[PDB]
A paper describes a structure:
Glutamate is the main excitatory neurotransmitter in the human brain, and it exerts diverse responses through ionotropic glutamate receptors (iGluRs) and metabotropic glutamate receptors (mGluRs). mGluRs are members of the C family of GPCRs, and are divided into three groups based on G protein coupling, sequence homology, and ligand selectivity. mGlu1 and mGlu5 belong to group I and predominantly couple to Gq/11. Constitutive homo- or hetero-dimerization is the defining feature of class C GPCRs, and mGluRs form homodimers mediated by the intermolecular disulfide bond within the N-terminal extracellular domain (ECD). The large ECD of mGluRs can be divided into two parts: the venus flytrap (VFT) domain and the cysteine-rich domain (CRD). Here, we present two full-length mGlu1 structures in the apo and intermediate active states at 3.96 Å and 3.65 Å, respectively, using cryo-EM single particle analysis.
To seek the mGlu1 active conformation, the orthosteric agonist L-Quisqualic acid together with PAM Ro 67-4853 were added during protein purification. In our full-length mGlu1 structure, residue Cys140 lies in the disordered region of VFTs and the disulfide bond is invisible, while the dimer interface is also formed by the B and C helices in VFTs. Therefore, the connected CRD and 7TM are also relatively far from each other.
Numbering used by the authors:
A (entry chain A), B (entry chain B): 35 to 132, 152 to 839
Write the structure that this text describes.
Amino acid sequence: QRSVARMDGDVIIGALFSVHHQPPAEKVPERKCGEIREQYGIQRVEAMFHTLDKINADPVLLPNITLGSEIRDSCWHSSVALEQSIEFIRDSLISIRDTKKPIAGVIGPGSSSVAIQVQNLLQLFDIPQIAYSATSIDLSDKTLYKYFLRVVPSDTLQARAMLDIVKRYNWTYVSAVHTEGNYGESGMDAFKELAAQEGLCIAHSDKIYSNAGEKSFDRLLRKLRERLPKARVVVCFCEGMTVRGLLSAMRRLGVVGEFSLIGSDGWADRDEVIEGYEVEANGGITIKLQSPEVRSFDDYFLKLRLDTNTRNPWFPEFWQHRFQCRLPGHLLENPNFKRICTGNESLEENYVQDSKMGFVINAIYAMAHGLQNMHHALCPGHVGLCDAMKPIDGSKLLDFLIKSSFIGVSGEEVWFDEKGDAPGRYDIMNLQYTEANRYDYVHVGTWHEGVLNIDDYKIQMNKSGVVRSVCSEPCLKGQIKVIRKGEVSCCWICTACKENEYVQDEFTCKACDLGWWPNADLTGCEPIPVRYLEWSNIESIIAIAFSCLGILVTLFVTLIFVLYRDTPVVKSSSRELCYIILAGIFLGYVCPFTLIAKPTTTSCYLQRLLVGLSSAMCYSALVTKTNRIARILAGSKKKICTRKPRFMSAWAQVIIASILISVQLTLVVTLIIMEPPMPILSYPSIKEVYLICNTSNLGVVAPLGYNGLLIMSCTYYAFKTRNVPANFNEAKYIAFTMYTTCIIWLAFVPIYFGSNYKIITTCFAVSLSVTVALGCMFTPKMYIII
Amino acid sequence: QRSVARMDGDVIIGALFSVHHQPPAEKVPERKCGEIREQYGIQRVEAMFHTLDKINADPVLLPNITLGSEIRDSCWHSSVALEQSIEFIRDSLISIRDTKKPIAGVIGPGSSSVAIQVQNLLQLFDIPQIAYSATSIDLSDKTLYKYFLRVVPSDTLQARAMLDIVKRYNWTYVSAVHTEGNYGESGMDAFKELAAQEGLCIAHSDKIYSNAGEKSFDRLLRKLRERLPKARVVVCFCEGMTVRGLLSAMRRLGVVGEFSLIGSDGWADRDEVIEGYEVEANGGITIKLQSPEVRSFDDYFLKLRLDTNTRNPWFPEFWQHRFQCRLPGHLLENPNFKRICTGNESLEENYVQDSKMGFVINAIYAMAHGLQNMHHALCPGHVGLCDAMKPIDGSKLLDFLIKSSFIGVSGEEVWFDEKGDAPGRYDIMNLQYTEANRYDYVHVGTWHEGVLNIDDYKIQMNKSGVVRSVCSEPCLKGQIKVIRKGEVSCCWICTACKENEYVQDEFTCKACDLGWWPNADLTGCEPIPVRYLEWSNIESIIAIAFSCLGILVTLFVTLIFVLYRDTPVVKSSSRELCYIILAGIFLGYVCPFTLIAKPTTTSCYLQRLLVGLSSAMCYSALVTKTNRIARILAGSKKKICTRKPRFMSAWAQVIIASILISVQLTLVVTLIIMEPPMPILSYPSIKEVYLICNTSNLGVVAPLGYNGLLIMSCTYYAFKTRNVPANFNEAKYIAFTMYTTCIIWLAFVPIYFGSNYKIITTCFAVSLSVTVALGCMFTPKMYIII
């Protein structure tokens, strides 16, 4: 029959405490348990034999309520744990109906994959189990799993601690590995999710099984050992044997000093992971739990003796297994042990206090303050249990646990949040050889509930500031866009934007509107070309000087004409003729100085009054003279025509020649009232702002084409003028004047259309055509009359 | 200390037949049970014993293997079955370590909630549950629920049968109702999904609670009044108490017979729920399980005695329950009756066999066949349990049960598919009037495995009855636009297709192409017939008559001209210049003949010769006859010019006139090499395609640009030549003919723009312009000369 340890009291509490090992792999149909464990077995059974003797006599935690124990071996195998679970349940359910008291809770199964399989049983009877080691994620969901809370932190905390280490050195693109099953998968899924909220891009997602072939660790090496300049921090949510395989693979192909792996809880400080491969792992971070060794136990356990401990069955087999000595004094002595011994042995022989024995005594105390919250809220002012508490429940008792907090045995508090997750107080251990060849795990600070406080004076002392997650650098210089490289996020590509493009997004610039292109580093679109036209260009200063020289030659002609009326030719020919051509030429010569200007609304009126009225009134003045002689030439002696449409005075003929002047003034007024004189900003390029007045091709072909047909009217009535015995050869120079104006008049338009700054072409073309007309007409008729 | 009925054997089978009632006695913690149900308790305990006493005695099913049994009570409670199950899973454990023997399976607990909470206790020991009543939807998840067969239909099968009724009468919009809690939610979500993929639309799902106010049941009917003419039928997925409330509120308002209700499995043979509300219930279909009456049990059970059945506790104490008697002769007698029992009593006292007595004896035989697989396939050619198979296994039992099948007690086959679901074989009922005041259920066909088998001549007794509850009528008529009525596809609102719209899809009428009206039956777009006429219409008979009379009158003016050479003007002047009038206008009068024609590349080209070159030749006539005297004007004494542009002969003046004929031809011939005449389908409307050959405003004014200069040149040299005494004032005749023809030839083009039938305008106008030239030159020529 399987034996049990039992401590008396009133409110007895059950426990599992994996005494024996796992039964043999094939003997599970009869499920006969293996050998004693003596780190988890007989160190923990004595936890519930001396801590339950502290609480016994403690007058502040259970005053005058005697607490009790039961310990039923689980043999690390879910079948034996389940057979033993029905015994607590049986005696509880027979007791509540009718030597057998109800068990109030369970001090936790050893692993996590027996915590699910014993909670699915205990959930049905309303009895909370309180785990001390069950670090698996899916035991957190309070929809399936109510009766399960822990004094050991969950796997979302390890995932977050690994994110905090990685993101505290600006690492943001990492390879990932994890062992197959629930552990590595769950932890990597948690971490990979938390990574995806801060722009981390896991360079290589991976899976591998622990006893998979040497080819599987070897191909894993090839895979991860590609992209070496891009990512060197491999996050390993791994077990010790998977990492021992990856270090053994890295020994074989000899790529020892390449990349800096960071571990998980699987390989805290234990040396089975590293032994024989000490050179591959130097400068390798882990995280481990902080379970402080309890000094209050080493006193008790190491003063124990075989002969004076009758409350622990499994203890005589523990002595025989520890000391190689069959003791035939008491029964159940193994045959393989010779050299019969005494009870005067040192329990000190390679004694090591358990890692997870701070957790058993945090766990029992969490279960012994649910019986203080209950004993005062439901039994106010009583010594011993009152009636309503006496046949103890679990539904109210679980709430009196989930709101319990305390101080532990190591100064740190035990307290449960809303889903039974204990506080994450995690250490960090870098591994490095400090003295001669001795590779050890050195403590370098702690994670502490999101407060990472890693000590950089002890962290590495390896190579300099280790090449980051550097696949595509932070290349965001002046003018730069981040190309993103569709497929991947982190490896974006470093590329400049065009000149016109402004940095709207750091990921994409936009070519801002015409009128604008941005400043240095493409930040803000400023009113770029304020380029001036008003006064002159320095090249247009010769055209300004030629307009001035024009005004000089009109004043030279006035110096011989107006105040010197002493000439027979101007006495016999009408004077008003010569007054209207000098007024025409004067208007066409003040014009070029008013042309070069920054066009405004009123300055556009000036500029169209310039081209329209100056050219038309200049040539209307010239044709008043040529019309007066044309009327003679066509109506006197050479063109035989019947009609005489003329008046009986020379002044009336000068007035008839003046009728045509005003018609071009009516044309330009009807063209101005239609489309107004307004300045327009011109953008033929990104750096060009000529700001030209409204002066369409309609306004430069209509009045100028009407002066062109007026030169054709002169040419028809200036045919035989070449050889006529008229006034002092003047008539042949009238024909030459019309030829020299009409040739450049026709040559103007093609060069005008093709050229850009064609306004200087208009001023120089109008100025040259009028000065050759002035010169040809006047310079013989002023020089021969001396 | 609840009791157990047991019988001896070699392979024992457990069951949880609900002996007592669900005790609300105080609460759970006392655990005291109610009364022996006798329609669910003791009635099926002797059914298990009868079923086993047919199997211990036939050599076909378990020869030399003896079955045993363990009948225990569940007291119809979630927390009494859970205590009792522990004595089957503390026989398997103790009988395999260490009389007591292994129990192989648990035959069904009745209530479905017990069948979830006692199968999260039988996974852990690998023991098949075989349910006989557990109609839950989610007891088919083979991830959470694995050791769980059931010989009763799933609720997705019933939800399919519900849909199949509504799909056979061709209904497509219906209001839903379901009782809150697992039953109604499950089966309504199943039906809503099945509806959604099929193309139904559930009108309003006012799902309600069972024990709400009569004003909440009023609020159901207050909503039902919306869409009362449109989507009137309810699918009541409820227990009978919600139906009782829904007919209480129907009687309240007096909205008696507007819609029928198609009831679910909760209301099919519930008559108790319709006692007093029969007037609201007529015409309502239902659906029930098909569980046949078993005769073999009824004969055995009704012949039983209180002194013979020693294998059944509860049965020496059920006699007082059924018969209202009390005997001092039996121990543990109830006090509340005081008429003394006898041993010899009738047991047929309103005996009705259970609805599930054909489901117990089907379930046990599913086991006895699944062990006739195990005893064959592990112990071949053996008698009794062999070396292996003892203690009997878990996961090999379950893999021989899942492929067990053999005919039941009632001719129907038990057989499991891969999820422990039995076959869907459903009856139907309906409340109807059979005789004088007789609302009762009548069977009206069956639903078997998705085949529905109603016969209408026993259902509803009404031809039209419930109208097609569709959210719009079947709006598909001849060529109707569908807006789809986006709230639901199938219930689209009909709208009228536009004059240009067509159905590419029925569900979207959309516009056709321009000039291509939407063809008959809206199957696309269709082009229409063209307005052109090659052969003569009545409107062309006038035009060809004008063309041909035009030719004949030219033959008459030649009869008075070329045959009669006694003309004063001609035979002094050239005869060919008076003849080239007729030669030129020949083609001008032929314009109407081949203008009003078909567009073909040669005939529509000939029509471009009509618009261009023929019109050029008909004005080549006019320019020869008027520009001869015009050029002679410029060269004679009557008007003088600067040169001598004429030779010494009239034959030189003929080829000089032919220069003006040549440039008039050449102007329009420069365009014929650029545009070859292509027939353009220029559509002036959607109801006309019209087909004008290659024509534009440029195409018709192509000769007009030189006609204007020819007429103006000949007008300037004929302006006052009218007043000059010609041969008989014929210069004034010519001046009047040009004056009348010119102004109407300008006034052509506003009529060409206003009126669209340009072909009639050009032919009619050219006929009007050429007739006056003959009527006012050639007729006075003839009349003066004769």
